């Protein structure tokens, strides 16, 4: 499953919910230490709506546990991650993902 | 001018030789027959930077040209005139950007504007 490592504490009162749009600046990495994708390099926050499975299930659950304005570090095991196939060319098979995400705004 | 006179008169050079050799002048502690150890050359060798400083970049061409003319050995008057007419010739060194920094430096001297 996913885990919540509170790198920095956010608000704790508000949480993402169903049918709301969450914006994130996620920088991500493999478990060894290599980095695959970063929104921050692209310079645009990433948007998605808790519910229609834009992303892997794990990322969605992890961002669902989070608060507003709370950086964290998800650790999606392969099953809640891409899984055995892996993203071809980016994620090797059966790899564990670690995600430095930051829920910026909840709209 | 002294040096130039010396380089022309052979008897002058031979007299320099005889003098330095026969009176046993070291010509070494003087430095502190060898023409280089002779003070005749050394005077101009040390004084040359001043003279070259007296001429701005744009002139070296004419110098070689006049140097060229001294291969013919044009008279002082003759080289003078052959460089006088070539007033257009020297200059426009903006076309030669390599001379720009030299130009700027010799401007930045306590020497004033292009007088």
């Amino acid at each position: 499953g996913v885990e919540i490592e509170t790198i920095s504490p956010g608000d704790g009162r508000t949480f993402p919910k169903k049918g709301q749009t969450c914006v994130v600046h996620y920088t991500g990495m493999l478990q060894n230490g290599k980095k695959f994708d970063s929104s921050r390099d692209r310079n645009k926050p990433f948007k998605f709506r808790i519910g229609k499975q834009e992303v892997i299930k794990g990322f969605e659950e992890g961002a669902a546990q989070m608060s507003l304005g709370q950086r964290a570090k998800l650790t999606c095991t392969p099953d809640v991650a891409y899984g055995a196939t892996g993203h071809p060319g980016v994620i090797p098979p059966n790899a564990t993902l670690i995600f430095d995400v930051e829920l910026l705004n909840l709209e | 001018e002294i040096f130039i006179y010396w380089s022309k008169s052979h008897n002058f050079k031979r007299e320099e030789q005889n003098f330095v050799v026969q009176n046993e002048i070291n010509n070494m502690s003087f430095l502190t027959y060898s023409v280089q150890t002779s003070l005749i050359v050394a005077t101009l060798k040390k004084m040359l930077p001043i003279g070259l400083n007296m001429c701005a970049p744009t002139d070296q061409d004419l110098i070689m040209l006049a140097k060229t003319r001294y291969a013919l050995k044009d008279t002082d008057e003759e080289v003078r005139e052959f460089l006088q007419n070539n007033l257009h010739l020297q200059g426009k060194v903006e076309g030669s950007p390599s001379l720009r920094w030299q130009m700027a430096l010799y401007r930045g001297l306590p020497g004033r504007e292009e007088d």
Binding site: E5, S8, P9, Q31 | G108
Partner: protein, 896 residues
């Protein structure tokens, strides 16, 4: 396989100049407590999360050269086993990110008073963020050298480096028995922030290209004086010591006369009341006893140091007597004046040559007394705490108090010499400072190899700020960074402190420069000459010549270079803007010489010589060592023998050759916790094998066979298994019941001397590794050793051996297998993970350890500000401008 790139922030660290440590009978206290109060920190000024760690470090080794080191760069505090860092969520050390729990943990934020600690009694490093104890302590770390506090930051931070007393006033409180960190500075200098191992300092006219900086060593705080047992009473010494003591006791009496107080006959010593001019005998028997002992033991130190007190032409009358003056009359307790006039005779500088070190063997011996009693050095007078402000050797003692000691010895020797005694100091013979600092004394700044000039009269300047072993000149592009300038053929330079042109040796030349001496370097390639102008004047040789060197063949080319020694700073003005050049017009312009960077509008990139030893491949033409591939027959496996070519001759060089194979073995990201080869075992096993055959004539007590992590940067010429990095990141779930103790290190080996002319035969040492369980075991000629190491997942390990040659046949790597243990070729390569046949492809090569290698100076260094923020706020670091490189990561070496 493919080289990898990323954009990484610069990280730069600033320490205060406090240094502490421990050694045998050292004069330094143990406990040290300092805080760092963050004031404002942007989290994401760039792509990278803003870098900020706090911790201590080690003097010898913490060299975070700006640029790229290990991993993905950013070697702040704790990216090596010389540092020990902390981040609010982690306990960084050795480039690992082991987490830690502190109440309400959160990455370093504003108003976080990180209360770091260090007790080296065990060794230990504890923290207290914002008042809640950090449940993680480093331990067992090495103790050679000195530990200084140090933070590490990227752009966009601000921290206040509280230090106790008036330099920051400790928001929180040091735990019992702990000490402020301001009482660790020496009186010889003051307190100031400073960076660590800087090779460049922005200056008024521009960069400075500072050279190596000399730090203290953990010993230099402990005194090493001569003794007071091995000397006796020689005859004339027995004759004269009584007079010496008689005069010096009363001179010491008169030294403090009416200075602190006026004499009261209530006291005869120890409280500024001790004239006793007529009578020093009735004074305390211990006191007068050690007064006679001051005179004697002083002469005795002269004997141990090695003078020969011998009388000369007798002086019985040179108008000598105690001068009577109305001032300091004091009939009370002695009217006879202490000073008998000594104008008729003086003291030559030789007796001073003696007197300085006499003051040493006085002061340092008293310090060796106090530290044996329990006292320790400080900067604040602590009487009941048994700490003082002068418990240091003579070297680091304040100037004025050194002069006071020298005044006491001055009056003693002034009483003494006037008797024709031939006091004389035997000279003291210098030697090499140490074996490891052979290269740690020079930095060789050169321009890029792409600026090689091969024509045209070029010129530049090099303002030698200080007069030290610094030399400047042209050099050939293939400049070896290991040998000093001019010893080879690849350098035409000019040394200043002596005054010496240098090439394939040294020759007299010119005059030594003083400060601010521009040394204009020229080159006239068409005439193939080099000229040097020290302050305009052309440096004339010790002859009629003008150019320093003649007939310099054009060859491959030349480019500017300047070597700068310890404490030596400079200024390499290649002159992008010619007006900034100071002496170009006076000499170098009226002759056809152009400045070097005459149109390079972008500044000339410069490369210097790092002193960070990285492993490098065996040169295919090495002067001495010779690696030979040897394919394996049916019995022996493939093997990379090493042979010593030059043994037993002139230049039969001997030194430890830190060897290492190229490709590593990598453990599994998850551990397994919860005749002929049997097929199933050899198909599903994970234990791998290799071995090293140390031959006959190579004493097994001179090899060290094992593994090295990819961060082995220790070129130690006195190597042993006690000079290897170690640490134990003990994490506790609470004050009791600690629940994890990881042991980390950068080198895992066994010393062949354990397994062994009681015998003379070939010896073989094998090294097993169980990649799944992380365990590691060593075999010795068939037996099973006692050593065993257990390493955490993802660990990379290079096979490596450290050998000190004693024969023209030193070692031989033996890449082979055993019954049901796959060879190394299974691990190092992926396409052979199922091949039980040993292999040795050409990429598997032997690599030694080269202590020095060229590297780039970034064209844009960070800009940090340091300033006393106030009496109560302490010093205040601050960095604001972002700055990124684009690193290049070689995956196998974990280097960027």
């Amino acid at each position: 396989l493919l080289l990898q790139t990323n954009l990484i922030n610069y990280v730069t660290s600033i320490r205060p100049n406090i240094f502490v440590g421990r050694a045998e009978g050292s004069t330094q206290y143990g406990k040290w407590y300092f805080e760092v109060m963050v004031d404002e920190v942007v989290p994401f000024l760039t792509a990278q999360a803003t870098h900020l760690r706090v911790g201590w470090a080690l003097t010898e080794g913490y060299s975070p050269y700006p640029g790229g080191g290990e991993g993905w760069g950013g070697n702040g505090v704790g990216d090596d086993l010389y540092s020990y860092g902390f981040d609010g969520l982690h306990l960084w050390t050795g480039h690992v990110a082991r987490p830690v729990t502190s109440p309400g943990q959160h990455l370093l934020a504003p108003e976080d008073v990180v209360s770091c600690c260090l007790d080296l009694s065990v060794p230990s490093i504890s923290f207290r963020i914002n008042g809640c104890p950090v449940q993680g302590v480093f331990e067992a770390f090495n103790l050679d050298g000195l530990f200084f506090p140090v933070v590490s930051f990227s752009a966009g931070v601000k921290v206040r480096f509280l230090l106790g007393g008036r330099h920051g006033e400790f928001k929180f409180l040091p735990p019992p028995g702990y000490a402020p960190c301001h009482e660790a500075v020496l009186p010889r200098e003051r307190l100031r922030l400073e960076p660590i191992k800087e090779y460049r300092r922005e200056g008024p006219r521009g960069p400075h290209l500072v050279g190596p900086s000399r730090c203290l060593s953990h010993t230099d705080f402990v005194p090493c004086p001569v003794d007071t047992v091995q000397i006796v009473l020689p005859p004339h010494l027995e004759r004269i010591r009584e007079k010496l003591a008689e005069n010096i006791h009363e001179l010491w009496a008169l030294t403090r006369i009416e200075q602190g107080w006026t004499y009261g006959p209530v006291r005869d010593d120890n409280k500024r009341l001790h004239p006793c001019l007529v009578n020093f005998h009735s004074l305390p028997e211990p006191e007068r006893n050690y007064n006679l002992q001051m005179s004697g033991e002083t002469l005795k130190t002269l004997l141990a140091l090695g003078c020969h007190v011998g009388m000369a032409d007798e002086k019985a009358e040179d108008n000598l007597k105690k001068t009577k003056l109305p001032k300091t009359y004091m009939m009370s307790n002695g009217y006879k004046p202490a000073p008998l006039d000594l104008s008729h005779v003086r003291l030559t500088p030789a007796q001073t040559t003696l007197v300085d070190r006499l003051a040493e063997n006085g002061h340092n011996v008293w310090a060796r007394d106090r530290v044996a009693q329990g006292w320790s050095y400080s900067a604040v007078q602590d009487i009941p705490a048994r700490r003082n402000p002068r418990l240091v050797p003579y070297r680091l003692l304040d100037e004025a108090t050194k002069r006071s000691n020298r005044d006491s010895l001055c009056q003693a020797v002034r009483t003494l010499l006037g008797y024709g005694y031939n006091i004389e100091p035997p000279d003291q013979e210098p030697s090499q400072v140490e074996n490891q600092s052979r290269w740690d004394r020079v930095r060789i700044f050169r321009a890029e190899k792409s600026y090689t000039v091969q024509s045209g009269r070029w010129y530049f300047e090099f303002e030698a700020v200080t007069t030290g072993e610094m030399r400047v000149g042209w050099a050939r592009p293939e400049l070896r960074p290991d040998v000093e300038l001019g010893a080879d053929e690849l350098a035409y330079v000019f040394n200043g402190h002596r005054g010496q042109r240098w090439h394939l040796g040294s020759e007299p030349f010119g005059r030594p420069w003083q400060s601010g001496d521009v040394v204009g370097c020229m080159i006239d390639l068409t005439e193939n000459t080099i000229i040097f102008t020290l302050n305009g004047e052309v440096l004339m040789s010790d002859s009629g010549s003008e150019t320093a060197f003649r007939e310099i063949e054009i060859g491959d080319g030349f480019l500017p270079v300047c070597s700068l020694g310890p404490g030596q700073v400079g200024h390499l003005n290649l002159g992008q803007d010619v007006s900034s050049l100071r002496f170009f017009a006076i000499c170098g312009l009226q002759e056809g010489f152009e400045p070097f960077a005459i149109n390079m509008q972008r500044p000339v990139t410069t490369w210097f010589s790092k002193s960070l030893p990285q492993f490098e491949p065996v040169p295919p033409e090495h002067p001495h060592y010779e690696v030979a591939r040897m394919d394996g027959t049916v019995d022996t496996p493939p093997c990379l023998r090493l042979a010593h070519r030059t043994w037993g001759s002139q230049n039969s060089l001997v030194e430890m050759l830190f060897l290492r194979l190229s490709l590593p073995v990598q453990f599994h990201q998850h551990f397994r916790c919860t005749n002929r080869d049997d097929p199933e075992i050899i198909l599903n096993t994970t234990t791998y094998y290799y071995s090293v055959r140390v031959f006959a004539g190579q004493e097994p007590s001179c090899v060290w066979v094992g593994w090295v992590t990819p961060d082995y940067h220790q070129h130690d010429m006195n190597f042993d298994l006690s000079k290897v990095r170690a640490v134990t990141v003990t994490m506790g779930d609470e004050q009791g019941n600690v629940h994890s103790s990881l042991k980390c290190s950068n080198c895992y080996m066994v010393w062949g001397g354990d397994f062994v002319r009681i015998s003379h035969t070939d010896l073989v040492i094998g090294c097993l590794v169980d990649l799944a369980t992380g365990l590691m075991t060593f075999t010795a000629n068939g037996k099973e050793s006692n050593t065993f190491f257990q390493v955490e997942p993802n660990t990379k390990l290079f096979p490596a051996v450290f050998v000190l040659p004693t024969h023209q046949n030193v070692i031989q790597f033996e890449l082979g297998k055993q019954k049901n243990i796959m060879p190394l070729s299974a691990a190092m390569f992926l396409s052979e993970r199922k091949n039980p046949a040993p292999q040795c492809p050409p990429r598997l090569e032997v690599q030694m350890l080269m202590p020095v290698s060229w590297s780039r100076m970034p064209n844009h260094f960070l800009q940090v500000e340091t300033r006393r923020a106030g009496e109560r706020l302490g010093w205040a670091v601050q960095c604001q401008d972002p700055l990124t490189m684009m690193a290049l990561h070689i995956p196998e070496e974990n280097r960027c």
